[PDB]
Design an enzyme around this catalytic site. Structure first.
Site, PDB file in Angstrom:
ATOM      1  N   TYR A  72     -29.521  29.625  14.000  1.00  0.00           N
ATOM      2  CA  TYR A  72     -30.789  30.304  14.257  1.00  0.00           C
ATOM      3  C   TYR A  72     -31.227  30.067  15.709  1.00  0.00           C
ATOM      4  O   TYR A  72     -31.012  28.981  16.266  1.00  0.00           O
ATOM      5  CB  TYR A  72     -31.881  29.745  13.341  1.00  0.00           C
ATOM      6  CG  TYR A  72     -31.973  30.317  11.933  1.00  0.00           C
ATOM      7  CD1 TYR A  72     -30.863  30.868  11.289  1.00  0.00           C
ATOM      8  CD2 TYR A  72     -33.179  30.269  11.231  1.00  0.00           C
ATOM      9  CE1 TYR A  72     -30.959  31.372   9.993  1.00  0.00           C
ATOM     10  CE2 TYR A  72     -33.285  30.770   9.937  1.00  0.00           C
ATOM     11  CZ  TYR A  72     -32.172  31.319   9.323  1.00  0.00           C
ATOM     12  OH  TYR A  72     -32.278  31.807   8.042  1.00  0.00           O
ATOM     13  N   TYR A 122     -36.153  38.862  10.528  1.00  0.00           N
ATOM     14  CA  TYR A 122     -35.854  40.236  10.924  1.00  0.00           C
ATOM     15  C   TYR A 122     -37.010  41.183  10.645  1.00  0.00           C
ATOM     16  O   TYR A 122     -37.326  42.039  11.472  1.00  0.00           O
ATOM     17  CB  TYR A 122     -34.592  40.781  10.255  1.00  0.00           C
ATOM     18  CG  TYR A 122     -33.325  40.400  10.976  1.00  0.00           C
ATOM     19  CD1 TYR A 122     -32.285  39.762  10.299  1.00  0.00           C
ATOM     20  CD2 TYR A 122     -33.161  40.668  12.352  1.00  0.00           C
ATOM     21  CE1 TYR A 122     -31.100  39.407  10.967  1.00  0.00           C
ATOM     22  CE2 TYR A 122     -31.991  40.317  13.015  1.00  0.00           C
ATOM     23  CZ  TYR A 122     -30.960  39.686  12.318  1.00  0.00           C
ATOM     24  OH  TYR A 122     -29.799  39.319  12.979  1.00  0.00           O
ATOM     25  N   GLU A 175     -25.316  36.489  15.288  1.00  0.00           N
ATOM     26  CA  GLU A 175     -24.658  37.209  14.183  1.00  0.00           C
ATOM     27  C   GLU A 175     -23.198  37.479  14.485  1.00  0.00           C
ATOM     28  O   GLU A 175     -22.379  37.381  13.592  1.00  0.00           O
ATOM     29  CB  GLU A 175     -25.385  38.504  13.810  1.00  0.00           C
ATOM     30  CG  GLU A 175     -26.870  38.338  13.447  1.00  0.00           C
ATOM     31  CD  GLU A 175     -27.141  37.651  12.111  1.00  0.00           C
ATOM     32  OE1 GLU A 175     -26.219  37.073  11.504  1.00  0.00           O
ATOM     33  OE2 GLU A 175     -28.306  37.698  11.666  1.00  0.00           O
ATOM     34  N   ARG A 178     -21.336  34.347  13.801  1.00  0.00           N
ATOM     35  CA  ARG A 178     -21.176  34.150  12.357  1.00  0.00           C
ATOM     36  C   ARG A 178     -20.154  35.088  11.753  1.00  0.00           C
ATOM     37  O   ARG A 178     -19.470  34.701  10.803  1.00  0.00           O
ATOM     38  CB  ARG A 178     -22.486  34.385  11.638  1.00  0.00           C
ATOM     39  CG  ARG A 178     -23.541  33.338  11.838  1.00  0.00           C
ATOM     40  CD  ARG A 178     -24.796  33.825  11.194  1.00  0.00           C
ATOM     41  NE  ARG A 178     -25.928  32.938  11.391  1.00  0.00           N
ATOM     42  CZ  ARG A 178     -27.043  33.274  12.026  1.00  0.00           C
ATOM     43  NH1 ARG A 178     -27.201  34.497  12.541  1.00  0.00           N
ATOM     44  NH2 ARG A 178     -28.007  32.372  12.156  1.00  0.00           N
TER      45      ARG A 178
END
Ligand SMILES: *[C@@H]1O[C@H](CO)[C@@H](O)[C@H](O)[C@H]1NC(C)=O
Length: 261
Positions: A72, A122, A175, A178
């Site tokens: 994060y 988000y 992202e 990930r």
């Protein structure tokens, strides 16, 4: 703490690939993996955070601070009027908020706060960006580089501009780290702006669920079918680790034992 650097203003596919590999290697626990996919550390590792220093338009820079346990973004800094200007999300609590300021600005001799007046969900960012969905916010290298220039060193910018920058940076950095799938979408569209497909958004929303399912799989079988989406938005039902593995760059930390290979 280590700093991974990336110049989005003057770059190539192969340089972004190297950036992704570097970020994954700094983020991952050196000893944890499930099914050959590296896993992030627990929240009590000796090195808790990482910095990602991004350069963009007119050589201006922004530094993101990422939590290693979950990747994060906790906040960012920019050089502003000779000061480390630190911007932290408005729900980052007590001593960790102290730590984010100190980590973002440690080598700097002067600092000034400019809070992020919202949290990092988000839904929150989409609201601040004034869009129905981040599906409507184009991603891309040139976009990232330009957005850096709209924030870094700027005495004033709207929450909207900031939130759009954050939507772009979070997806193209965290992202993408990930998910190899999302990295590959960036690389496929490296020379153009693109609208993120339904698979990008779906993977983002389900990382935790996917990480749990892979961790808890026995000999490659997921305990329950995983309902995901294909790139064109159609339903994707995943039954085994090997079906989803190629899309994975990092697993969220999940305690307990798993098949490491
Ligand atoms: C990118 O960097 C290279 C190497 O320094 C330089 O030759 C080139 O002009 C730069 N590209 C642009 C157009 O900014």
């Amino acid at each position: 703490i280590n700093t991974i650097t990336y110049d989005a203003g003057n770059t190539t596919i192969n340089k972004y690939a190297t950036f992704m590999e570097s970020l994954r290697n700094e983020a991952k626990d050196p000893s944890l993996q499930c099914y050959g996919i590296p896993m992030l550390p627990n929240n009590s590792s000796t090195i808790k955070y990482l910095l990602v220093k991004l350069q963009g338009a007119s050589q201006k820079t922004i530094t993101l601070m990422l939590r290693r346990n979950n990747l994060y973004v906790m906040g960012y800094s920019d050089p502003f009027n000779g000061n480390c200007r630190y911007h932290i999300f408005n729900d980052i609590t007590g001593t960790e908020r102290t730590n984010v300021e100190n980590t973002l600005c440690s080598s700097s001799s002067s600092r000034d706060a400019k809070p992020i007046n919202y949290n990092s969900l988000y839904s929150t960012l989409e609201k601040k960006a004034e869009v129905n969905s981040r599906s409507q916010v184009q991603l891309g290298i040139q976009i990232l580089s330009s957005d850096i220039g709209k924030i870094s060193g700027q005495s004033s910018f709207t929450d909207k501009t900031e939130a759009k920058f954050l939507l772009v940076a979070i997806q193209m950095v965290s992202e993408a780290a990930r998910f190899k799938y999302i990295e590959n979408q960036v690389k496929t569209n490296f020379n153009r702006d693109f609208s993120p497909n339904d698979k990008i958004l779906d993977l983002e929303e389900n990382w935790g669920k996917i990480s749990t399912a892979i961790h808890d799989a026995t000999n490659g079988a997921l305990p329950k079918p995983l309902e995901l989406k294909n790139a064109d938005g159609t339903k994707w039902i995943v039954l085994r680790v090997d079906e989803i593995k190629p899309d994975m760059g990092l697993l969220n930390y999940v305690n307990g034992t798993c098949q490491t290979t």
